């Protein structure tokens, strides 16, 4: 709930308006460059399906993780900025990211 980037964005993007979500990652690149990962390095997903893709380059990301003392309604997050390879699961047509699988 409010002040640092994670508390504000988790609320504005409707992730913590009615619950506290333990972890969430935000990617800070242009949307089309993130969508472009679906034709980059094909890798297996954690669940064994093979519709996951890893970005060739690292991307700027912000990890938001609830502190050990966060409780609904006052969710509280620690903000960590990183540049990581993202791994996304892709589906559909256009073949676009539908889930985060990991980040390296």
């Amino acid at each position: 709930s409010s002040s640092n980037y994670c508390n504000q964005m988790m609320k504005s993007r409707n992730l913590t308006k009615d619950r506290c979500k333990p972890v969430n990652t935000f990617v800070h690149e242009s949307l089309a460059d993130v969508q472009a990962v679906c034709s980059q390095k094909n890798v297996a997903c954690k669940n064994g399906q093979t519709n996951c893709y890893q970005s060739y380059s690292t991307m700027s990301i912000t990890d938001c993780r609830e502190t050990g003392s966060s409780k609904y309604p006052n969710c509280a997050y620690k903000t960590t900025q990183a540049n990581k390879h993202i791994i996304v699961a892709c589906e559909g047509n256009p073949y676009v990211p539908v889930h985060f699988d990991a980040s390296v």
Binding site: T25, E29, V98
Partner: peptide, 15 residues
């Protein structure tokens, strides 16, 4: 209601 692709952008993307 949101598609899975729209939900991914709302939850994980910030240009």
């Amino acid at each position: 209601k949101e598609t899975a692709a729209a939900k991914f952008e709302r939850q994980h993307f910030d240009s």
